[PDB]
Amino acid sequence: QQFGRDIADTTDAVRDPQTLEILDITPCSFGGVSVITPGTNTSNQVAVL
């Protein structure tokens, strides 16, 4: 085997050349950015989730 696939059609692991070892490939972190705000009247101070 040269590279591994998940249950879905995505690559989960690869056999790294130059060392013949197994490297797990994780989709690097991403996410939505939400803003906690009490309202412009209440405060301009906000938090970022």
Add this chain to the structure above:
Amino acid sequence: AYTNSFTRGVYYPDKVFRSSVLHSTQDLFLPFFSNVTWFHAIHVDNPVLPFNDGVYFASTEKSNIIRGWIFGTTLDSKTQSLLIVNNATNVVIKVCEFQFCNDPFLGVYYWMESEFRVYSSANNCTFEYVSQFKNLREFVFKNIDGYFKIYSKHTPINLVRDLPQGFSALEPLVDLPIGINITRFQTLLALHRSGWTAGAAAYYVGYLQPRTFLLKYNENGTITDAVDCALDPLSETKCTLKSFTVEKGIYQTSNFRVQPTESIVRFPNNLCPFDEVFNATRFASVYAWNRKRISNCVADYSVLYNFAPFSAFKCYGVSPTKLNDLCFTNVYADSFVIRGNEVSQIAPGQTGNIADYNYKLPDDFTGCVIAWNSNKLDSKVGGNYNYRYRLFRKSNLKPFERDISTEIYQAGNKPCNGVAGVNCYFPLQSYGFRPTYGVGHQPYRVVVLSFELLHAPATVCGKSTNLVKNKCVNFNFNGLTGTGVLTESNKKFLPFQQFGRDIADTTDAVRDPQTLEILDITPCSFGGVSVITPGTNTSNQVAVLYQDVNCTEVNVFQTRAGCLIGAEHVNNSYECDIPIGAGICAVASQSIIAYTMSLGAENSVAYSNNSIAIPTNFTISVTTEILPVSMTKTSVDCTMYICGDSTECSNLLLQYGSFCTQLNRALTGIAVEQDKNTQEVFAQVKQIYKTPPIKDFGGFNFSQILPDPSKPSKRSPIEDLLFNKVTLQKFNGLTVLPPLLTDEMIAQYTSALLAGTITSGWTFGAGPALQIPFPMQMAYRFNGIGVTQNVLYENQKLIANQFNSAIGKIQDSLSSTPSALGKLQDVVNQNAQALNTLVKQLSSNFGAISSVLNDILSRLDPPEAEVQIDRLITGRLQSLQTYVTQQLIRAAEIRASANLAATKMSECVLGQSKRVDFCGKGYHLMSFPQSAPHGVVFLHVTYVPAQEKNFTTAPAICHDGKAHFPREGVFVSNGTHWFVTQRNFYEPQIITTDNTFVSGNCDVVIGIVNNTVYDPLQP
């Protein structure tokens, strides 16, 4: 001979590693249980077999008689050949031109290898490679795109002969870029010296075929099992469901349609008058060449080669055959006589006496010229002076010009006054043909065909097949091309109508040429094929249903649903277990039986005008109602999902408008709606009610529904079992927002509702929770269902025992019956399947050169790559829009279910509902809510009559002339005395004035009996 392949010939399709997943791929595979040609090396044998797509080679031996294989096209020194050999040192793969012997082999001597008789010469040697019963060798040899692949497997097995019944996946062991075609295969054997006597071994050859295989990978990645989709309907069903084990049910796997057996072409049943032209008795002189216009006719230009005799013809446009396909508005036939040596002038681009002054073709002529010697007809002894040709003219003729003037040609400056004389010449000369002239000077008749194509219908053109009836055929009626069965028709077509059209533009009928009969075109029989199976776990027996197919196309049974085979039709009816359609359902007696469904057991009630049935006894039944409340709060990112980490696709996506904002907002709306649904169904209590530490509920036991402190999640055994029964990942652009309410918090809400209903009855729903003893609350509920509270108090122990027994049984039923939580599992499965399909659609090309965006961006320049990237962008946008629409509809269904669950919690748990069957079958007593993943389970406790007794009944009692009617309940007569009892329980009481009211007299009420109404005041 031929042996059974069993389940062998499966190899790893690629170097891709898969763990615990089923993968379906279409490659060259050896079909399961196929006939494999097996040969014995010993003769009391290595024939040359073809290679075709691939070869599966099996070897059962102990002395290694099979040492090698030979592949090639001619298997000789003439062409390059592939040779794999094992000379007891290493496996040698040589692509060279070898001259193999008629029986090439490796002669082993007394043991040591001594003779190598596989080849005599090596030529060109384009490729060379060296690699370093009780046993089984399995090999798969394939040649694709110039790469030759060898898959190998060693399996020690003890068997007398034939392949073992064991599944082994063949790991690829050699992959070589050979580059040459392989059409023939020959094995190499090790000849044992005694004169040769080969060892006793079996070598098996199985040809690979294009097959679709579903392979089951394990956690290690080994292929532990496989399914051949084309082997049988059950395996095709396993392939369709993408699962090795299928549950009982109907499954549509593929479609059966009958292909047309043969093609019929129908064309109308007058010939162009070419006989009148070529075989005319007289021909014109060339100076007065004749022109015949041909039109409105069909001509056979194939036989131009024989339109006349001893002809000589040449076409300057396309071949005479192609003239037969072609059509033209007009054809012109020019004809005349000239000398043989002048025929060469009747060609484009020629000059000469004839071309210049008699008959002139254009430089761009595309027609045909035909000429034949006419000496016998046009020459005469003494001279034929009829034929003339112009010798003088002041200018050349323009193409197709004709000049028949006979003015005296004035060659000098003196006038000719209309008479021939010196330098004044008559312009025509006769050929004076005589039979004794040389062939160059003999007469030739000439026909020139020119083909005009102007702006008008082509009325001059250049097959008819026998009609077949009631057979699926591809028909061509005067250019109408279609497929279907042609049958007799009763439609009276008007004479001008050629084909009949049914509503919505369908070709229903056509009138045939040469017969004028109207034939109805019924579309060829097509229908899905459904598979009746009791489930692979129960049995591998399978029935097949062809939908909407008559039983005339390949036990059988014809139903309105179609033709069903493999199940026996049985007259007697049973309850349906598998649906087929048309009122027919189908496993019994170790076979599949098809029967008409029985709607119910017949039960006629013994109605009588004076008879009643009163329940002398009752039972408490607990039923689960499982309702989904929410779906996984999935969220997609349109920009990332459609255009992956590339600016180029992002710029183009921005040209499509606010589609990605609309889709994202729609998914956000469904996620917020899911949170609102869960909050609405569970958070119906202003306060969190806590059950008392002492479970003194008058004998009622709630241990199965009250939360268990020992468990590390405050969940009751029933909801813990529900969580354990239902069983459920990071993608690109796809995330799952967690629910606003945690499972622990939802369970706490359910526990609070359960404590509130247990302690305060329905009062906590109305307002402040007012404590009331559970037996007294049960008495109020019994009064609510029309049963006097004394009935519960007299039977409190019996009711508590029944309630505990039912509560135990319901947890047993939930733990023992699968698909009880199937409604909750279905929504989770549907969400997961939609997500899986959406991720799978990323690998769809949608007409692009490649599915992956990086490849199409890297290999193509942006001016051309933009259209391919646009095809992918539009395809992914359409796919995401479809997924969002499916999710929106599914969320609407989930919201309706959640609204129903909220209403049921408000009316069945927070209160006692008099709505029939709204909170479970029977008179509703109460309901207990239980949390479940994305759902709520309602345990409806209901009162059901158990023992029924007949009683003679009177609407009223006649006492002293007055009619008495029961204030509550009905009058009953056990046969000696009359009594008054509640309708839902048999508790007879003496007729008194306090339980009966007097109305009117006895001469108005119909069907009343006389009795004594005991007045309590009288004694």
Add this chain to the structure above:
Amino acid sequence: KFNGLTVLPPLLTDEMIAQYTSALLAGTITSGWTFGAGPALQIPFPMQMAYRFNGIGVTQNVLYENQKLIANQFNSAIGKIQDSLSSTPSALGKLQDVVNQNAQALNTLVKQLSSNFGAISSVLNDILSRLDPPEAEVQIDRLITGRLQSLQTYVTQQLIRAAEIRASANLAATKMSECVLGQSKRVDFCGKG
């Protein structure tokens, strides 16, 4: 059903649905609501109607004193039901409407095959025959995009109509359980009055 379409027969036939309806009618006229609750208890129909009168807050005696008048009114109303159904066009429109909508959806879907969607011709065979591979594939793709969009629109509209029919069927099942299998005290759920 001539253009790749199919109409699967209903699992319950006309006669079997009629048999279910007949069983429900017999249960109501012989046991009142007791058959819906559980075992069918034989009940005199005048007495069952008397208790149904008691259920709406009218004493049982009023029915017995007026049994003949109630029976005459009930028979007259039942007779008027046939006249109302047979003499009012569009009375069955609520069912004919869905039947027509499904028929119209199928008719438009098969009429969309006659559409070109910008291709040189609607017919696939002639354009495949008269066009070379690298432009015929573009025309075929354009037709496939148009036909798939038509099929998806039809499928989505059918799904929405199926959701509407699912809601109507849920209401019908609830009405069968509350009005037919029992007596409903929620006003206007089972008719005015």
Add this chain to the structure above:
Amino acid sequence: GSFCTQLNRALTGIAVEQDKNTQEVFAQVKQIYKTPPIKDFGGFNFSQ
């Protein structure tokens, strides 16, 4: 891809849903009840 497979799956789902709708609406009786042979219903007529 499986666009038409999704469409066919959805249509199969709606067909099964129609079957379920009819079964839920009409099959609300465990056993088929038969009307008594004599119509002695106290003057009420159910022949229609």
Add this chain to the structure above:
Amino acid sequence: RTFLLKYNENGTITDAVDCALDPLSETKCTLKSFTVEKGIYQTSNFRV
């Protein structure tokens, strides 16, 4: 002109509607029926 032709069982055109003759004919053409039921029907769009 656009004409709605009524072909009988014989295929003979027994009646026709001129879709532009009058608003009633426009309604008949829009409904694709020779008889229109009582009600309001949208036939075309008026633009200046």
